[PDB]
Amino acid sequence: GFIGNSLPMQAVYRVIESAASSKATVFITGESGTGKEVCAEAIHAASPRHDKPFIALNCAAIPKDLIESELFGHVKGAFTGASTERQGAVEMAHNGTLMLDELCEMDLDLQSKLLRFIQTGTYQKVGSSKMSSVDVRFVCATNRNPWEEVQEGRFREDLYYRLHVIPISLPPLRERGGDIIEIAHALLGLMSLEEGKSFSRFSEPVLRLFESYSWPGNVRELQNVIRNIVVLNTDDEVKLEMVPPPILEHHH
């Protein structure tokens, strides 16, 4: 779902294609705002299991005490809030690909249960001792340095080495050559549809700025900038005075 054919992305695409035909676990890293879920979905789409579900569990978007419920499910009444019985992400992903995003947010207890599941395919819903099993291909991602999480004792060493089979390090936006403006154009069209506008081009100073700024927030930051411009202005062309702070100030 990536856009562009910059040199560093070509290397990513080659690994995606080769990894897609394997069940080996992929472990994605990259700076804040790089496309970890885009990469995970692209692996699924290129894989023989592309017609089965792709499911992404963002471990940070969930209270830490509820990751286990979201991952493995829960029976009714398993904990005070368990209003009904819930199907886990592992069941939704059976025969497909499960992305464990922001994996280092799991507590050490859940990491132990996860490692068991990865080894065997067997799990239990929260609140039950009954075993079930599924078949998932795992893709993991983190914005931490996973080796550092291990050295600091926040992430299990056995789990790290079980999962870290096919690492993919995503190129930061600033290193992606022509991809920056290709992505920016796609976002310009999409945000224009969202907002009822009709932006179609960037002026040459805007092109130069977007192609020189360091984009510390990567593609998320570019999405914010394009959304800002389309929400706050009405024109066919993005002009330099429309670019929000502190892009220009920081750039200098």
Author numbering: 141 to 392
Publication excerpt:
To characterize the mechanism of AzaU inhibition of LuxO, we crystallized V. angustum LuxO-C in the absence of ligands (apo), in the presence of ATP, and in the presence of AzaU. All three protein structures are highly similar (rms deviation < 0.5 Å). Rather than forming closed rings, V. angustum LuxO monomers in the crystals form continuous helical arrays with six subunits per turn. We also observed the same helical arrays of LuxO monomers in crystal structures of the V. angustum C domain alone (LuxO-C), either as the apo-protein, with ATP bound, or with the inhibitor AzaU bound (discussed below). Indeed, the monomer–monomer interfaces observed in our LuxO-RC and LuxO-C structures are similar to those observed in NtrC1 and other AAA+ proteins that crystallize in closed-ring arrangements.
Here, we use X-ray crystallography to study LuxO, the central quorum sensing regulator in Vibrio cholerae and related bacteria. LuxO belongs to the subfamily of AAA+ ATPases known as bacterial enhancer-binding proteins (bEBPs). In LuxO, as in NtrC proteins, the phosphorylation of an aspartate located within the R-domain activates the C domain for ATP hydrolysis and the opening/activation of σ54-dependent promoters. Here, we present crystal structures and in vitro and in vivo functional studies of LuxO that together reveal what is, to our knowledge, an entirely novel mechanism of AAA+ protein regulation, in which a regulatory segment of the protein prevents substrate ATP binding and hydrolysis by occupying a portion of the enzyme active site.
